[PDB]
Amino acid sequence: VENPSLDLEQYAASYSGLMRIERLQFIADHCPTLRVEALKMALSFVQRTFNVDMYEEIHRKLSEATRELQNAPPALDTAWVEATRKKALLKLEKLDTDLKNYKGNSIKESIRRGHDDLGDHYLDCGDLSNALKCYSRARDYCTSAKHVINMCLNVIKVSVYLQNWSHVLSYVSKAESTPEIAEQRGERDSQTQAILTKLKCAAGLAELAARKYKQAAKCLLLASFDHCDFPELLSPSNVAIYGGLCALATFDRQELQRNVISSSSFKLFLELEPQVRDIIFKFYESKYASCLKMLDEMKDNLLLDMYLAPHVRTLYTQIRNRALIQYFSPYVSADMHRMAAAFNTTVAALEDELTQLILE
Amino acid sequence: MDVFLMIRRHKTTIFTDAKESSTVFELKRIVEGILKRPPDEQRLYKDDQLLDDGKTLGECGFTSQTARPQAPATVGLAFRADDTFEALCIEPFSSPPELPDVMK
Amino acid sequence: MSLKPRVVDFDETWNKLLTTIKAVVMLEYVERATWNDRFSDIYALCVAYPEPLGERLYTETKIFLENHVRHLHKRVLESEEQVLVMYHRYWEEYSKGADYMDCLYRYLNTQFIKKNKLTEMNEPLMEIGELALDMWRKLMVEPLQAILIRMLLREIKNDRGGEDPNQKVIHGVINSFVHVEQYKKKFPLKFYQEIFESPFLTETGEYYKQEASNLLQESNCSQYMEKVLGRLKDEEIRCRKYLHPSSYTKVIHECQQRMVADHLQFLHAECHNIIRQEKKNDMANMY
Amino acid sequence: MYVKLISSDGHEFIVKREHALTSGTIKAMLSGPNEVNFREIPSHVLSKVCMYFTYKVRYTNSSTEIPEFPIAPEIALELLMAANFLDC
């Protein structure tokens, strides 16, 4: 399933990390011939951030892609591999020795800082269990509540890839509801602090996985336009797509005029989204043809959105059903031929759609 | 690694400490922390390698499992002369029969 | 381990053990050579298989320690304040002496504290230090309270006038009060507060009130208040010579409240006078 | 001055003055800067505890490998149950 409506230049700019690898994965799942160059750019990315195992994994899957490039038209710097890996293991011993030295120095700020940095370097390894040890030994070893917040932020950055939302959501809610957010200030009194909007993105991924999408969009409502920055999760066009379309899919028309048009916190995000704004305009003016048209056009690009990909099929089905209810409501006698013109369909297949709706 | 050496004779047994990046000259300076010995006219012999003062163990390769703390490959001490070697007596343990249960 | 019979070698080890311990009982002058002897004691303890033996051995050590304390109790039988100094010497050395015993004891601790101790019947297994304090408090009964605290009281007298016989002795007697306290160390402070402090507060408060009151009438009351301010400080001085955390804390304010009864009125009256006529220093002291 | 360990089977090991920080226990018994003795138990316990102490002086604060100490094959269940019997 190949959609060429993607912007990898923005995702190279606004993002980095595993998602640069992972969206290629959906390329590698469904959307080919968009793969090898971003695979080599990701291979050059994993030439940084201390990662050798996954570097060799990208070299291996790039060799697979090279076997595919025996029809269509890899780099293993083993000197770099051995040098960086021995430097990383020796610095693991350096920081174990420094952990000894700083327990000798006994600064829980600096000790728990070392726990945080070691968990960061185990993210740099991919050792989510060892980073879980380090942040588990940064867990109740902090000084202020802000540092517990930063710990839970790092654990949520891991939880981007953990997604084991039984107690991964206990860490997510440990950042959300637990730490008396900014100690009764609200990310220090009119947030620019990219924490609560990270909790928007985290709840979006979580109830993407845990499928209570109404509460996910309910989280995604009130994001702040001030920061909008992270090179793995937060770009305001993509999070704007997230919030606007989850709110369009999950919320009633009472709230679709009451909390979508009125959403001033999210207003500049839809200023970043002209097409989402036009879909909003056509759907609220009940212009079903071009609205569901643009909906199903960007359905392929939100199928290119890897995590939204299984759920966009459900939710745009719901939005089309919402449009059909929007048509069916105000009348006693509607021509289906008018409805065939309105929903860009036939009569009989439209009738089968409506019969599927007649079922419940 | 950070290598806890075990210079092991029958009774001459020094548990000293060194690195993978450590040399032999300053190891003898740590032997000078043991029994106050000049490195210059002495050579730590293992009967395995010509080990002069400036030879680095990264060139030798005393890694973590090749030189463990509780059980290294010991950079050998000589019973100090030009070409001698402290007699390596790695001390034996006990040899049990199959598992008793009374001693738990 | 299975090296030899666990029961047998008590006597030889104990002989070496006592030989070295006596050298340390409060202090037999252990030197480096003697330390070597103590190490041979390490040999003695280590040769034994002290698993059933060590507790008995420590018990024997306890008995010897107790008799030594008794010997010292015989030794406390002396003159006046010289004894305070001697007692201070006993306590000072005794801590070190028992401490060295503990050093020898260090291995025994791992033998029974790790394995099995009461502290985890009349057979306790704990520190020699905790043991020594208990044995030592037996010493603490008569000489501490009878002479030593009284001497400290005289030192209080020295606060009123004179200078403290030696603080080594007198403060040390206070320390004797504290060391000889509950072995549990639940109340480390209690003896000084119980035996001594009541008459301390009583006499000090009463004397300052009475004398200072007479002198207050005699020598310029406003300034005399300043003098009282100094007076309590002098009390503080001597209370510093021999000290306990509870005495000075209460006794100073006690005098303040006592004396203010004489002049609650002059405080504001003279204060008003300060308002009327600027007297900053009087204001400072009065403040 | 300098110290020395003695075992039941004669492990009379010369133990340092200055940099003996690899040891923990004998540092308490530095009668200097000497006859440390553990002769009543056979050395299958004593040398085990000494090598485990060298092991243990190193391998603290180690988020990497802290290996379970190798214990004899007929007691390969006491490979774990040396926690029950001989602390390794």
Author numbering:
A (entry chain A): 77 to 149, 160 to 446
B (entry chain P): 1 to 104
C (entry chain O): 1 to 120, 132 to 298
D (entry chain Q): 17 to 49, 58 to 112
Text from the published report:
The CRL2 E3 ligase consists of a Cullin 2 (CUL2) scaffold in association with a catalytic RING-box protein (RBX1), with the substrate adaptors Elongin B (ELOB) and C (ELOC) at its N-terminal. When associated with the von Hippel–Lindau (VHL) tumour suppressor substrate receptor, the CRL2 complex is the primary regulator of the Hypoxia Inducible Factor 1-α (HIF-1α) transcription factor. Activation of CRL2, in common with other members of the CRL family, involves a cascade of E1, E2 and E3 enzymes, which conjugate the ubiquitin-like protein NEDD8 (N8) to residue K689 on the CUL2 scaffold. CSN5 is responsible for the deneddylase activity of the CSN.
Using 3D classification, we were able to generate maps of three different structures: (a) a holocomplex map at 8.2 Å, (b) a map of the complex with little or no density for VHL at 8.0 Å, and (c) a map of the complex with little or no density for CSN5/CSN6/VHL at 6.5 Å. The two partial complexes likely arise from compositional heterogeneity in the original samples from which the structural analysis has succeeded in isolating subpopulations. In line with subpopulation observations from our cryo-EM, we identified subcomplexes of the CSN–CRL2~N8 missing the CSN5, VHL, ELOB or ELOC subunits. An interface between CSN1–ELOB can also be seen in the partial structures of CSN–CRL2~N8 missing VHL and CSN5/CSN6. The dissociation of VHL and CSN5/CSN6 causes the N-terminus of CUL2 to shift downwards, away from the CSN. The plasticity of the CSN results in changes in the C-terminus of CUL2, which is clamped between CSN2 and CSN4, in order to accommodate this shift. The formation of the CSN1–ELOB interface appears to arise as result of this movement in both the deneddylated structure and the incomplete CSN–CRL2~N8 structures.
